[PDB]
């Protein structure tokens, strides 16, 4: 469904930023 | 239409098999002509681990013509205009600016794809090149004071993460 796809896209963008922060702080 | 059908097909593939360090898709599926992409600077490059949002706006005749792409947060890169617009070879057909880019760099055509655009933008972030003059100040400082460019790149990364 378009609804679930859209919420999943938001979740994955939030997670990309969280992962980038992790990798930046561990380097 | 074929543009909508093609954008729907590319989105499906990108969601099934996502490229590393990139999340992209229509901001809202009632308008597949406007996508948001979130791109992370690759490890060991100038903007490593920075997180950069951008908007891709697709033309009615897609995939015959390329989208326009624009970063929506601060950047300082020779090939990104001050207003965020991205200036890379793949976002132009062989006819427009036929010499304004490297001969080795691919041009737009229907065999290209959103995935190929974003991978190309990632490479551009990793490998700044001062011979497209979209940002004059950035190109000059890349050429004449790269230490100052590096310092700014690191500030941009830190701000993009809020840290």
d(CA B8, CA B1): 11
Indicate the SS3 state at residue B55.
strand
Q: Residue A4: which domain range? A: 1-27
3-state secondary structure of B129: coil
DSSP secondary structure code for residue B105 in this structure: S
Total number of domains constituting chain A:
1
What are the structural domains, with CATH classification, of chain B? 2-160 (3.10.110.10)
Residue in B with minimal Cα distance to A8: B15
Q: Which residue of A has its CA nearest to B50?
A: A20
DSSP string spanning A1-27? Answer: -HHHHHHHHHHHHHHHHHHHHHHHHH-
How many CA atoms does the CB half-sphere of B147 hold within 13 Å?
Answer: 0
**Contact (CB<8Å) B23/A12:** yes
């Amino acid at each position: 469904s378009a609804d679930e796809r859209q919420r999943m896209l938001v979740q994955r963008k939030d997670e990309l930023l969280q992962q980038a922060r992790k990798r930046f702080l561990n380097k | 239409g074929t543009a909508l059908k093609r954008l729907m097909a590319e989105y499906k593939q990108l969601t099934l098999n996502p490229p590393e360090g990139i999340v992209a898709g229509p901001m809202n599926e009632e308008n597949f002509f406007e996508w948001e992409a979130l791109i992370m600077g690759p490890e060991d490059t100038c903007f490593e681990f920075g997180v950069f949002p951008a908007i891709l706006s697709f033309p009615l005749d897609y995939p015959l013509s390329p989208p326009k792409m624009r970063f929506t947060s601060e950047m300082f890169h020779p090939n990104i205009y001050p207003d965020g617009r991205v200036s890379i070879s793949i976002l132009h057909a062989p006819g427009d600016d036929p010499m304004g880019y490297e001969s080795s760099a691919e041009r737009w055509s229907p065999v290209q794809s959103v995935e190929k655009i974003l991978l190309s933008v990632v490479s551009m972030l990793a490998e700044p090149n001062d011979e497209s003059g979209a940002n004059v100040d950035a190109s000059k400082m890349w050429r004449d004071d790269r230490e100052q460019f590096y310092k700014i790149a690191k500030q941009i990364v830190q701000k993009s993460l809020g840290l």
